[PDB]
Amino acid sequence: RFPTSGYNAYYDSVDKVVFVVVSFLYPYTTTSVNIPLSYLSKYLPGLLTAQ
Amino acid sequence: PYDETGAQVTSVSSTPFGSLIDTSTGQQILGTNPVLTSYNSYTTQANTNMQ
């Protein structure tokens, strides 16, 4: 499961959806890197409107 | 005139077209519209094609 503390749960209130983004697959899981906003505005039409 | 929050002002300032709030998915309308460029040279370009 994802953390109960030490996380970020983002609340897009324009699609009204609670999302968490985590770096997973190969190669690098170890080497955490912030996930962009760019491809996420694709897949949520409410990060295509507002924060 | 009387403004929002119960103030009164003399001034009018309008809403600008292409930064309104849509009811389409609760979005925001584009900065360039067909209606925009149609009016941005309305002198010919409001007379369109048949319409």
* For A14, nearest residue in chain B (alpha carbons): B26
Query: Rounded to whole angstroms, how far apart are CA atoms A32 and A2?
Result: 15
Question: Rounded to a whole number, what is the distance in Å from the CA of B44 to chain A's nearest CA?
Answer: 34
Quick one: chain A helix, strand, coil %, rounded to 5? 10, 10, 75
Inter-chain touch B26–A49, beta carbons under 8 Å: yes
Query: Rounded to whole angstroms, how far apart are CA atoms A51 and A30?
Result: 28
Q: Does B19 touch chain A (CB under 8 A)?
A: no
* C-alpha distances out from residue B16 to A44, B22, B36, Å: 27, 13, 11
Extract the tokens encoding B25. Answer: 């998915």
What are the residues whose beta carbons fall under 8 Å from the beta carbon of B21, sequence distance 6 or more? B27, B28, B29
Please list the alpha-helical segments (H only) found in A1-51.
38-43
Query: Rounded to whole angstroms, how far apart are CA atoms A45 and A16?
Result: 11
Resolution in A: 11.2
Q: B2 and A25 in contact (C-beta within 8 Å)? A: no
